[PDB]
């Protein structure tokens, strides 16, 4: 149960990823529950959790699958620059 | 005496500056043409 990650470019509206509210940059994400799956797709956005807003490959922590189910492609979020920031 | 020594050392410089150069040139080219194979060719540059 990680806390205090901030979606840049996007908001979380409980139906997956949703378009950000006007003049409200860095919308806060709810409690992320991280585990292991043990290894063993379309309409699931493999978002990168960054240590800082700078976003270089040094400050990449890990990638998080964010559902994005309804009326918005995962490729549309990549263009919107969606990414989970620890710092700001 | 000083003006004559300056004139002397001026002409010494002109000689010695030219000498070290002519040596180096000569030192570079002494192996080629004394050597047989390049000197076999360039008969004109061998005679010089």
């Amino acid at each position: 149960y990680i806390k205090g990650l901030y979606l840049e470019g996007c908001k979380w509206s409980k139906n997956g990823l949703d378009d950000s509210d006007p003049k409200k940059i860095f919308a806060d994400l709810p409690i992320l529950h991280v585990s292991a799956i043990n290894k063993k797709m379309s309409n699931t956005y493999l978002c990168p959790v960054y240590k800082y807003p700078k976003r270089t490959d040094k400050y990449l922590i890990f990638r998080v699958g964010l559902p994005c189910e309804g009326s918005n492609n995962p490729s549309h979020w990549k263009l919107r620059g969606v990414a989970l920031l620890c710092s700001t | 005496e000083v003006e004559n020594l300056i004139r002397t050392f001026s002409d010494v410089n002109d000689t010695l500056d030219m000498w070290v150069k002519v040596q180096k040139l000569w030192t570079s080219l002494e192996p080629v043409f004394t050597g047989g194979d390049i000197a076999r060719q360039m008969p004109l540059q061998a005679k010089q």
Partner: protein, 1058 residues
């Protein structure tokens, strides 16, 4: 102008320097003379065979009949089966004839192999064919198997690709089972390894291809070599770019592991060449930009002229190379091209722009800048720039250059793929599985484990594991692949690991390998029986499991390595493990000698020997003369040249060639001494901190942690040594009491918590060694009289000896907290005293045994008095006299070195209290010498004084005048200069001299022979560390007994009589 005229006839001359061309053209008549310079003209043709030819008509005319590439001692030989090179007078005409017949033979040989590879086995084929054509043949096979596979998918024959993949796996099992046969020579090894670096990439690709036609893009991407029967010419396709094979004789060359990055890099470099733009791969150092460009050249069979670019390169020097590439038709990568001065690159841009414009228009000839005539362009040119963004060199390239060169950003090559190749190269199947596990461990263990300097979990240690993991796979093939790797991972790393990190490691090893329940170790049943037997010879040695384990681990490394080193803190039992192992190996066949030297104690120049500035004669080196004596195959001596001092960049660099697999010691006078099988190099380093990561990876480091030989073991031994001294009843009683305060309650752990700011920072073992010394020194009276005491009388002596050994280093405020802690744990203490009364004031009397306040002896005025030279008996002097008497009267032992340093504040009566003790010495019975250290004092300054002060000799051994037992006071011991590495050079001589009882003579005549002083005591006095004053080395602290001199509370007793 004539030279430039020959240069234009055989372009490759452009890549040779003017002296070497002039040498070759002058020696054009005698073609044997040219043989040295063949390796500059062409690639991988080091030496050429010269036959007798036309021996009947126009004789003494030699003919060239085979091309050799020589690697070390072995060669790759492609004979010219027809197309002999008859070698005429004019060198540049027969050299052209040789480059022509080279290619024309390879084309003939490669043609007849790309036919053979289909109707001959892969084990059978690769053995017959030369490296370059085995590689080319294997590649031709694979691209036929895929093509044919995909062709049958397009016609809808189901599982037609799965059938071809199965062949591609057979082809790969063959190549891994040819790595297991260990064929002779460095050529056939580099031949089979390059085949395996390819066939993992061939398999990897065609394992996850998924294409339903030959023309589908995921296949077109892939580098494909095929032999076209219609144009009878090998053509190498990448995407849409179909180059012919150049047929340069590359011989047997190392190939880099082909990553999915490298495949995508190859496409870019190809797309550049097709569009006639240059290529310029730009990445951080160690990605092998140069090597990947070369690998593409070697894939197309074309010579790649590397030119190590620098500041010294001018626009003329560069223009010469480019006029070679265009006229020759060879590629030409420029290693570190950023490092060229920006001035040059503006002129080079016009050279490259002029070449480009000619290639785009397909011009047969173009005029180069600063050239009067138009020069011939070969269409198959290329030019590449290996740059570095985040430059260590100069600013980014000019605006003109950017346009001409198509970049490839090259990341650091994924480590898993490097390992996967290297595991295949050894002879393992299921490489993909292992290589993931093996990576995960080393990537994770680097983060989780403590960042210690001797830990290397980079590629250096990884490649080291895989050669040892391989040597184990060849011998036991039937054994499970995971267990062999898991075992070869374990046995190498376990030695290195500190005691805290062994449970962390064994956890990671049991995380990533949960299938493998338990792995059996190398029993070594011969040596394991001797260690107990050998230990019980010496009275003072106790055998713990965690100690016996570390002796085995030193022997495990001693067998495989020749440069094994023994890391660990001070008093860890490193020197004793050495001595035991050798005393075991002596009793199992061959005897084993150790030669302890301190490399820091002596100057680098004086250790290895250097050329004398006066009389121009060579002075022997100290190490060289030990090494030369040590390396002789006579009477199976097998000596171990140990280097007790700390490793530094300065002195190991000269010795670096010995540690490596060459095993030859260079003195830098043109003398190279070979290392015999019998002799070995050791290092008793404490830290290994200030040493390069390269030199560490060479040596096989065994770490000995504090807990391997605990202080509990040292105490238990000291008590064992008392019982062997003929006094069992005493030892039995000192046991019950020593255990009660030291092991049962962890008093040194409790003290160290409650008391803050100790004036000198000492380890817990050092404190215990000092206890056992001082506890000896007190009871040394009752040994002489054979007087056993009660448990009350010992329990006073022990708490005295504890108080000064453990709590001596503490200042006045902490002495009270220490004394208050003895009251909490119900030790015997003085019941009655004054305000600010401590244990430290009192002592336990010999005559009658109880706590007595230690009043100083009453002063006797020394006739005529000068206040300046008037030293009186004082409370602080008494306690110092008393303690110094206990350490210095003792007989030399394993615990004691008869030496007692006293730390203390500036002007706290250190120097006085020693000079008060150093009087009242019978001149006949004892002597005294004072040598004041300073920042200037080097080891040769100190060595020269002690050597002069004891000249009397008893046989080999030296001594002070007569046999006096001189006590060498070293005032201001801390002062000598601490260097950048944090190692005091002159104190590493002091330590050597106290420990080993000697040093190595530095007179020119006699080198590599020890001088050993028989009877010397050593007092020291230093201002306590901190506040920009030097701390003494931790290693040295262990030799000395250490107590803190404190300013008096009342100087009434001192100055009141005066």
């Amino acid at each position: 102008a004539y030279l430039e005229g020959k240069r234009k006839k055989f372009p490759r001359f452009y890549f040779v320097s003017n002296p070497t061309l002039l040498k070759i053209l002058s020696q054009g008549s005698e073609p044997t003379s040219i043989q040295e310079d063949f390796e500059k003209l062409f690639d991988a043709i080091t030496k050429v065979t010269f036959e007798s030819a036309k021996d009947k008509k126009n004789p003494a005319l030699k003919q060239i009949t085979q091309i050799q590439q020589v690697i070390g001692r072995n060669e790759e030989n492609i004979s010219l089966t027809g197309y002999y090179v008859k070698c005429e007078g004019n060198i540049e005409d027969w050299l052209k004839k040789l480059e022509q017949n080279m290619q024309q033979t390879l084309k003939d040989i490669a043609s007849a192999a790309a036919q053979q590879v289909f109707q001959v086995g892969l084990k059978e084929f690769v053995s017959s064919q030369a490296s370059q054509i085995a590689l080319l043949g294997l590649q031709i096979l694979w691209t036929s198997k895929v093509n044919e596979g995909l062709e049958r998918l397009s016609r809808n024959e189901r599982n037609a690709m799965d059938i071809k993949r199965n062949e591609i796996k057979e082809h790969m099992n063959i190549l891994s089972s040819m790595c297991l046969e260990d064929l002779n020579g460095a050529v056939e090894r580099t031949k089979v390894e390059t085949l395996v670096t390819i066939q993992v990439h061939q398999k990897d690709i065609s394992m996850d291809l998924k294409c339903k036609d030959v023309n589908d893009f995921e296949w077109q991407k892939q580098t494909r070599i095929a032999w076209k029967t219609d144009i009878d010419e090998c053509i190498i396709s990448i995407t849409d770019w179909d180059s012919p094979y150049s047929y340069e004789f590359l011989g047997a060359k190392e190939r880099l592991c082909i990553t999915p990055l490298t495949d995508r890099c190859y496409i870019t470099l190809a797309q550049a060449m097709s569009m006639y733009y240059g290529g310029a791969p730009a990445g951080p150092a160690g990605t092998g930009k140069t090597e990947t460009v070369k690998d593409l050249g070697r894939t197309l069979g074309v010579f790649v002229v590397v030119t190590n670019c620098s500041d010294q390169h001018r626009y003329r020097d560069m223009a010469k190379i480019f006029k070679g590439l265009v006229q020759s038709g060879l590629w030409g990568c420029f290693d570190e091209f950023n490092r060229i001065d920006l001035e040059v690159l503006s002129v080079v841009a016009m050279q490259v722009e002029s070449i480009t414009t000619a290639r785009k228009q397909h011009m047969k000839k173009f005029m180069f800048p600063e050239e009067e005539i138009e020069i011939e362009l070969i269409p198959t040119v290329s030019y590449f720039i290996t740059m570095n963004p985040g430059y260590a060199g100069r600013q980014e390239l000019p605006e003109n250059l950017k346009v001409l060169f198509r970049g490839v950003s090259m990341m650091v090559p994924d480590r898993e793929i490097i390992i996967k190749v290297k595991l295949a190269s050894v002879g393992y199947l299921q490489i993909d599985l292992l290589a993931k596990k093996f990576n995960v461990l080393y990537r994770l263990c680097e983060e989780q484990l403590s960042k210690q300097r001797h830990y290397d979990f980079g590629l250096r240690n990884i490649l080291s594991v895989l050669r040892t993991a391989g040597n184990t796979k060849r011998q036991e093939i039937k054994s499970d692949e995971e267990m062999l790797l898991m075992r070869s991972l374990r046995d190498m790393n376990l030695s290195k690991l500190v005691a805290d990190d062994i449970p962390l490691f064994n956890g990671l090893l049991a995380d990533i390998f949960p299938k493998l329940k338990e792995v059996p170790k190398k029993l070594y049943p011969d040596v394991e029986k001797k260690i107990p037997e050998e230990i019980n010879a010496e009275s003072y040695l106790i055998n713990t499991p965690s100690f016996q384990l570390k002796i085995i681990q030193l022997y495990e490394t001693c067998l495989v390595r020749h440069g094994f080193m023994l890391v660990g803190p001070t008093g860890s039992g490193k020197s004793t493990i050495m001595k035991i192992l050798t005393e075991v190996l002596t009793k199992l066949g061959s005897p084993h000698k150790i030669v302890i030297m301190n490399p820091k104690a002596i100057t680098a120049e004086q250790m290895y020997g250097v050329k004398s500035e006066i009389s121009d004669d060579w002075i022997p080196g100290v190490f060289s003369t030990i090494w030369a004596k040590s390396n002789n195959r006579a009477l199976k001596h097998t000596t171990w040249i140990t280097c007790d001092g700390p490793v530094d960049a300065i002195w190991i660099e000269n010795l670096n060639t010995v540690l490596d697999d060459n095993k030859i010691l260079t003195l830098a006078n043109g003398e190279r001494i070979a290392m015999t099988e019998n002799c070995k190099v050791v290092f008793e380093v404490e830290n290994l901190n200030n040493a390069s990561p390269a030199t560490v990876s060479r040596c096989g480091q065994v770490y000995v942690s504090p807990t391997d030989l605990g202080y509990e073991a040292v105490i238990e031994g000291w008590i064992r040594n008392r019982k062997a001294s003929g006094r069992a009843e005493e030892s039995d009683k000192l046991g019950n009491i020593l255990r009660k305060y030291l092991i049962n309650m962890r008093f040194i752990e409790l003290q160290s918590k409650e008391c803050k700011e100790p004036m000198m920072d000492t380890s817990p073992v050092i404190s215990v060694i000092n206890i056992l010394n001082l506890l000896t020194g007190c009871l040394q009276y009752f040994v002489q009289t054979q007087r056993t005491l009660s448990e009350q009388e010992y329990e006073k002596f022990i708490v005295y000896s504890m108080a000064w050994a453990i709590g001596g280093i503490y200042e006045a405020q902490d002495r009270v907290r220490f004394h208050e802690l003895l009251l909490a744990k119900n030790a015997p203490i003085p019941q009655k005293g004054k305000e600010n009364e401590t244990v430290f004031d009192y002592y336990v009397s010999q005559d009658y045994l109880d706590w007595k306040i230690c009043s100083p002896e009453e002063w006797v005025p020394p006739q005529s008095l000068q206040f300046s030279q008037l030293l009186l008996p004082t409370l602080d002097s008494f306690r110092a006299e008393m303690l110094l008497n206990f350490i210095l009267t003792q007989p030399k032992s394993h615990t004691c070195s008869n030496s007692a340093l006293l730390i203390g504040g500036s002007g706290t009566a250190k120097t006085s209290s020693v000079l008060l003790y150093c009087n009242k010495f019978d001149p006949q019975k004892m002597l005294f010498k004072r040598t004041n250290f300073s920042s200037a004092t080097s080891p040769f300054m100190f060595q020269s004084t002690i050597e002069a002060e004891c000249d009397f000799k008893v046989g080999k051994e030296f001594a002070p005048p007569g046999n006096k037992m001189m006590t060498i006071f070293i005032d201001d011991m801390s002062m000598p200069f601490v260097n950048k590495w944090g190692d005091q050079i002159t104190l590493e001589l002091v330590r050597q001299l106290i420990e080993t009882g000697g040093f190595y003579m530095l007179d020119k005549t006699q080198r590599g022979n020890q001088r050993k002083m028989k009877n010397l005591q050593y007092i020291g006095a230093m201002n306590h560390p901190g506040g920009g004053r030097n701390d003494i080395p931790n290693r040295l602290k262990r030799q000395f007994f250490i107590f803190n001199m404190i300013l008096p509370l009342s100087i009434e007793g001192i100055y009141g009589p005066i």
